[PDB]
């Protein structure tokens, strides 16, 4: 499913996004925009290591979710990668929040750096009424 702006905000807010570990909304806007644009069945192979990024959150099969052919693996958030390709986001939130709580935080997502960190990131909910 491919979320509209507004209605992923208000999504993420009644799941308890808002402000976890430190991090606004707009951050996780931000962030699930330039990831994967709003997209839960968004998937993206990394031919260099061997893992995928699977979701809205593109989320790592290699310390996050289990997929079974991502050599090295582990599973952090204990999760089945196949959970996180689901029109209902619960439990990519839930593994979102899993790989934030290490010290690294938002900043696990590279993508998070090059266009969110230190940027006026008000636009992501600016009328959605969060």
Same mark, same amino acid.
């Given at each position: 499913?491919?979320?509209?702006?507004?209605?992923?905000?208000?999504?993420?807010?009644?799941?308890?996004?808002?402000?976890?570990?430190?991090?606004?909304?707009? $951050?996780?806007?931000? %962030?699930?925009?330039?990831?994967?644009?709003?997209?839960?069945? /968004?998937?993206?192979?990394? =031919?260099?290591? *061997?893992?995928?990024?699977?979701?809205?959150?593109?989320?790592?099969?290699?310390?996050?979710?289990?997929?079974?052919?991502?050599?090295?693996?582990? $599973?952090?958030?204990? %999760?089945?990668?196949?959970?996180?390709?689901?029109?209902?986001? /619960?439990?990519?939130?839930? =593994?979102?929040? *899993?790989?934030?709580?290490?010290?690294?935080?938002?900043?696990?997502?590279?993508?998070?750096?090059?266009?969110?960190?230190?940027?006026?990131?008000?636009?992501?909910?600016?009328?959605?009424?969060?």
């Amino acid at each position: 499913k491919v979320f509209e702006r507004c209605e992923l905000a208000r999504t993420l807010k009644r799941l308890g996004m808002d402000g976890y570990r430190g991090i606004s909304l707009a $951050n996780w806007m931000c %962030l699930a925009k330039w990831e994967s644009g709003y997209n839960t069945r /968004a998937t993206n192979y990394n =031919a260099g290591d *061997r893992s995928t990024d699977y979701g809205i959150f593109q989320i790592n099969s290699r310390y996050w979710c289990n997929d079974g052919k991502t050599p090295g693996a582990v $599973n952090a958030a204990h %999760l089945s990668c196949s959970a996180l390709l689901q029109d209902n986001i /619960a439990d990519a939130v839930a =593994a979102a929040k *899993r790989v934030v709580r290490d010290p690294q935080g938002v900043r696990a997502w590279v993508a998070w750096r090059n266009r969110c960190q230190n940027r006026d990131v008000r636009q992501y909910v600016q009328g959605c009424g969060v």
